[PDB]
Amino acid sequence: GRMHAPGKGLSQSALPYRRSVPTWLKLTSDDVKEQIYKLAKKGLTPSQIGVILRDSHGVAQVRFVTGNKILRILKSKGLAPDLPEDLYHLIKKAVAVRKHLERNRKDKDAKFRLILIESRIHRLARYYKTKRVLPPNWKYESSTASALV
Amino acid sequence: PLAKDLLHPSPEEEKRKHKKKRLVQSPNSYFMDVKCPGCYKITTVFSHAQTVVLCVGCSTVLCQPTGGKARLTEGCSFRRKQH
Amino acid sequence: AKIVKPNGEKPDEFESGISQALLELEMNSDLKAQLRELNITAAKEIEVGGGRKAIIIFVPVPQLKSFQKIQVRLVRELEKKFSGKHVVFIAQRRILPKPTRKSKQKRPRSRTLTAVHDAILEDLVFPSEIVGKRIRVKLDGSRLIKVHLDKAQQNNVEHKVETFSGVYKKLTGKDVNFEFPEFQL
Amino acid sequence: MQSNAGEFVDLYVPRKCSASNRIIGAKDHASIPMNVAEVDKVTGRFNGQSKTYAICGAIRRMGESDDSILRLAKSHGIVSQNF
Amino acid sequence: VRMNVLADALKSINNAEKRGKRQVLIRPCSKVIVRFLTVMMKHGYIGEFEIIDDHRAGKIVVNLTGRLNKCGVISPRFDVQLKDLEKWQNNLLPSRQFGFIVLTTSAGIMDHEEARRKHTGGKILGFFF
RNA sequence: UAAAGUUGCUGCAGUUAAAAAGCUCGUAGUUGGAUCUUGGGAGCGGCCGUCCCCUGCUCGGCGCCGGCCCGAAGCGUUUACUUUGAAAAAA
The missing domain is CATH 1.10.287.10 (S15/NS1, RNA-binding)
Incomplete structure (x- = not known):
């Protein structure tokens, strides 16, 4: 049930069981972080970064590929x-x-x-x-x- | 029916059900080797894209965003890749 | 030779022979740059039920992902050398006890009993990866974990299943079986 | 139902559903006791013995009695496992 | 929202057994549900179950006999001395001859009859008969 | 006072018998997802039962050629909870 609506929606994103990275993805964790920095410098949010990444660059979850998640990669360097x-x-x-x-x-x-x-x-x-x-x-x-x- | 194999859903039944309500949670999306005939490079596009995935070294614009699955532009082919 | 014991002590003549057998792959074959920096921590010879033996090689944790690239490549040569034995590559996961009333830094979730026993199991079966755990809590009360390995590499690694069940049983003491779900992927 | 001396003291031991184990009360008139005859595995004739089944009225009113006899005859070997 | 996960579980397998199901999915999972179920199993009320591991909280799938008349939670988890445990089994079980209050002691989650012989009280979780 | 489950914690009721605010936000109040140790070592009865063990560093007694085994202090996530103990006028 929603906060400020009667809506009982169930439109959730559903991650797969296997947290293990796929095979085809040739980008190493560092080049993903380098591309995250390039998107953050353009002026995008961790939400917008994650979308642009999984669409054009076949990287499902940055947390799966790297260790950490997109804000914590932004925050460590100070792009957050x-x-x-x-x-x-x-x-x-x-x-x-x-x-x-x-x-x-x-x-x-x-x-x-x-x-x-x-x-x-x-x-x-x-x-x-x-x-x-x-x-x-x-x-x-x-x-x-x-x-x- | 009283007796149902709750641990062993037949794959006809599992693919029918809502993604969240599957015995183990499993999405209905997949990554595509989308190639345009004008250009050389195979780009990886997400099925439910929700952006305009472009040809890097512009020969075209590959996909256009809709409600669910994006429209792959007429001319483009796709292989669904898996692990 | 390449068997860097965690405590200030010595390896066995079997374990030093395995580390020389990794020098034998280094100073002959073309994976030599990918065996220079790769050290070993321990190795053990594990007598499973029936007339079968397996060999288990504990590994430095940050060097584990370097083994995961070069796993079956290297497993071939080490497994034909010790012909009848099965060779398997686990990282040496340090395993802190649960911080009690009686007994300093926050014990991280990585260094925890469950995360150790689950991360061992993940890199126990390597070529196949786990596509669901199930657990029969049987009538007597004891657990029986049922690890659903990938349908790809079934023909590769089916022969190691009853090994894998023994390797994990001797490590954790947890009764495990390995199955292959065909009906999905 | 047994005393310090170990004597069965209750004046009758009830039947109970071969499906869901529910004890079948003295005035449940919907309850269905069936005799399923077995056969000589080369001749194909009534041997003289049967695999007797008993359902409580409740499951029979639900309409699941069909599937419950179908299960009890499959796990009994009377019916084909393939089916 | 979902607050007492042990409530959702025991009500769902109670609902299911009243309906006459051979097994029931209970689709959040906690360690407290799993200990409670193992106690119901040791006394043969439910059949050997199964915990499905997704990478969130599990789902359990519980084989049922027709032995479980009712399982149930006591919410809130009231504290029970060894004095009081007579007055609970007095008002919360259908007889002295059967039925078991589960109560989480320090020794572990277990029936009222073992909480006597171990001589440890604790917090009432639920009950079953 | 019980009967009164007609004050309802145990334990009542609120579509029509009395009863849900016109509706929503909202602070104190109340309630709050999953997750962080387990396997075996020692011993007995006839595979199952009942026990001991799975924190560390100043002062001496079952002993030994500065320390090994152990005894007694003192620091040891903090609380609720449960069990025990002390203490708690009789009438």
Whole structure:
């Protein structure tokens, strides 16, 4: 069951049993990391990196090929973003909605969906403060939000 | 039926079922040796691509994204590779 | 010769002879650059049930993936040398005990009883790879792990199955069988 | 059902389903006791002995009684294993 | 959401045996389910089962007789002294002649009758008869 | 007080008998997925049962040509839990 919907969807990605790398994949773990760096430098998220990789370069899971996963490869060298991509995207969506709702006070549905998105943010913020990957001093305020692109 | 071989699903029954609900979890995707006739190189494309996989050294654009499986452009062939 | 014991001690004349048999492959055959840096930690001769013997070669863990490239290539020459025996290549996985009330750094999941007994089994059967574990918890209460190896390399490595079951049984004490599921892949 | 001295004291020992082991109560009138006759393995005639089967009314009302006799006659050798 | 995984298991094999199934898939798996089942097996209530290893939590496939009248969880896992264990088997089993409270002691997950002779109480997991 | 399972932890009810907030978000409250040790060594009864073992470094007694076996301190993830012990006026 979804967080802020009645939806009981089951559209999950389903990894195979065999964590063992396939045969055909000729790229060594280092050249995969080198290509991950090349994608990160272009300005892509670990989500967008992983998609571009498995599509055009036949690398199912970076964790399967290498040891580690894409953010931890970004983070080790310091190509990772300061605030997480998923909490970035909710703040990005909240600034989009709030801009729409500046000149559309009639749009009561928007206003309700804003409160649902605000709740997704506060909920993730609270999680990342327990894991100290955000400052304890940090708090998403909608007036301070437009600077956080 | 009361008695079902729950440990031994016949492969007609297993491939029928939802990927998550299979006795052991198993995807419905696969990697393709997609080759265009204009170019020399065999590119590895993911079946459910969801991007525009291009020919590196542009002779064409290979696949186009849809709901599920991507459309392989007319002219292109595919072998499904496995381990 | 190439048998670098983990403790400050000596190998046996059998074990030093196996490491000289790896020098015999180095200073003759063309896999010589891929035997220079590759050391050995131990080796044992394991008497399985019936009138059969196998040989088991423990390996340095970071050098294991170098063996995985050159496995069957090398296994041929070491197996014809010790003709009637089966030769198998496991890494020496150090295995820390469960940190108790009574008894310092966090014991990592790599260096754990289950991950040792499962990573050994993964690189026990090498040419075939495991496509599902099943476990009969039988009426008496004892487990019987049923390892479903790949359908490819069935004709290659079926003869080593009742070896593999013995190799793992003598190591961990866990009663194992190896099967081949044909109906999927 | 047996006392400190070891005596069977209950006034009858019940039958129970040859399928699902459910004891077959005194007033279960749906319950089906069948005699399946066996045959001389070269002549093909009634020998005089049978492989008797008993189902509780409950499984019979479910409609699974068919498959449950079919299993009990397959694992008994009466029916072809190939089938 | 799923919170007591031992609840999902015991209710699913209870549902299944009431239906008359020869075996039942119980499609999350924990070490506590596996110890509970082995206790039900040692007293012959369920048949020799099987733990399917995917690389997530397992799935178990449990051969059934028609001996298990009901298995069940007590949630929450109340603490049981050796004093109290009479009052549980008094109100939670169908007789003194049979039925077994499983309770996780320090010695291990086991029936109430072994928790007597080992002289160790602990937390009630469930019961079966 | 029991009867009262008509206050319901054990143990009640909430479609129509009394009863689910108009709907949703939401903080304290409450509840929270899987996963991290096992095989055997020693011994007895007739394959199965009941026992001992699977942390380490200052002071002396069953002894030995500075230390080996062991005895007594002191540091040893932290709690709930369970078992034992001390202690807990009688009436």
